[PDB]
């Protein structure tokens, strides 16, 4: 059937207030990445 193709498209694949809180989550992410 693919002998007569009318239209095709390319689809991208799926992806693989307070400063104290920001630092806490950032450092937590740092530990997470280190563990990974």
């Amino acid at each position: 059937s693919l002998a007569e193709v009318v239209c095709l498209e390319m689809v991208d694949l799926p992806l693989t207030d307070g400063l104290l809180g920001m630092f806490l989550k950032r450092l937590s992410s740092q530990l997470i990445l280190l563990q990974a």
Binding site: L19, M22, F23, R26, Q30
Partner: protein, 101 residues
């Protein structure tokens, strides 16, 4: 003091962490592709603080200045030293005879 030296290390370390954060945030953009174009305030504040403290440590680390007047270090130089002339030493003194030969 010597502790000053240790400080500068941590400053770089702090900066290093900032780098990681920045990289990650860049990845954030590289995974968000939004019109943010702005670093988080926390990370930039951390970077600035690291820069400041590291520079402050460096200021101590640079050393101590020296006075230009040539008559500074020569004030305490007594005449009993400048007269020795190490090249022109003579060994016919009472030191050898008095002491154990």
């Amino acid at each position: 003091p010597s502790l000053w030296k240790g400080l500068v290390g941590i400053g770089l370390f702090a900066l290093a962490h900032a780098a990681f954060s920045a990289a990650q945030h860049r990845s954030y953009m590289r995974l968000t592709e939004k019109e943010d174009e702005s670093l988080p305030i926390d990370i930039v504040l951390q970077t600035l603080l690291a820069f400041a403290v590291t520079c402050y440590g460096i200021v101590h680390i640079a050393g101590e200045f020296k006075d230009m007047d040539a008559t500074s270090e020569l004030k305490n130089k007594t005449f009993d030293t400048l007269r020795n002339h190490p090249s022109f030493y003579v060994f016919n003194h009472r030191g050898r005879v008095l002491f154990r030969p």
